[PDB]
From a paper:
The PWWP domain comprises 100–130 amine acids and is often present in chromatin-associated proteins. Our structures revealed that the overall fold of the PWWP domain consists of three motifs: a canonical β-barrel core, an insertion motif between the second and third β-strands and a C-terminal α-helix bundle. The canonical β-barrel core harbors an aromatic cage constructed by three aromatic residues, which is a signature feature of the Tudor domain “Royal family”. Taken together, similar to other members in the ‘Royal family’, PWWP domain also exhibits methyllysine histone binding ability.
In order to explore the functional roles of the PWWP domains, we determined the crystal structures of the PWWP domains from 7 different human proteins, namely, BRPF1 (bromodomain and PHD finger-containing protein 1), BRPF2, BRPF3, MUM1 (melanoma associated antigen (mutated) 1), DNMT3A, DNMT3B and HDGF2 (Hepatoma-derived growth factor 2). HDGF (hepatoma-derived growth factor) and the HRPs (HDGF-related proteins) consist of a highly conserved PWWP domain in their N-terminus and a variable region in the C-terminus. PWWP domains in this subfamily of PWWP-containing proteins also exhibit DNA binding ability and some of these HDGF proteins are implicated in development. By fluorescence polarization assay, we found that the PWWP domains in BRPF1, BRPF2, HDGF2, MUM1 and the N-terminal PWWP domains of WHSC1 and WHSC1L1 show weak binding affinity to histones with H3K36, K3K79 or H4K20 methylation. HDGF2 binds H3K36me3, H3K79me3 and H4K20me3 weakly.
Residue numbers in the entry: 2 to 93
The structure:
């Protein structure tokens, strides 16, 4: 098993939110230097971005049984559709 790379599918954990379907984005695409050992995360559904370290990143194939369940939070269910059906699309 390897370090996280752009295009990796995850659930990403932030405080006040459930584990959220997300992907690792490419930094070589932005014009922004990431904090040390943090990754640019794109959240499905909301189409928001944040920087998160590996402790908040849960690989999607391993964790979807547990986290890949409908939620009432705004964007979550759309985000589930997007990660399962077109995770690598332009949502921009």
């Amino acid at each position: 098993p390897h370090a996280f790379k752009p295009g990796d599918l995850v659930f990403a954990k932030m405080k006040g939110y459930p584990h959220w379907p997300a992907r690792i984005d490419d930094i070589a695409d932005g014009a922004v230097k990431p904090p040390p050992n943090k990754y640019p995360i794109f959240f499905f559904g909301t189409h928001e971005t944040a920087f998160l370290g590996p402790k908040d990143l849960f690989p999607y194939d391993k964790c979807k049984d547990k986290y890949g369940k409908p939620n009432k939070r705004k964007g979550f269910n759309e985000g589930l559709w997007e990660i399962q059906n077109n995770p690598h699309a332009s949502y921009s």
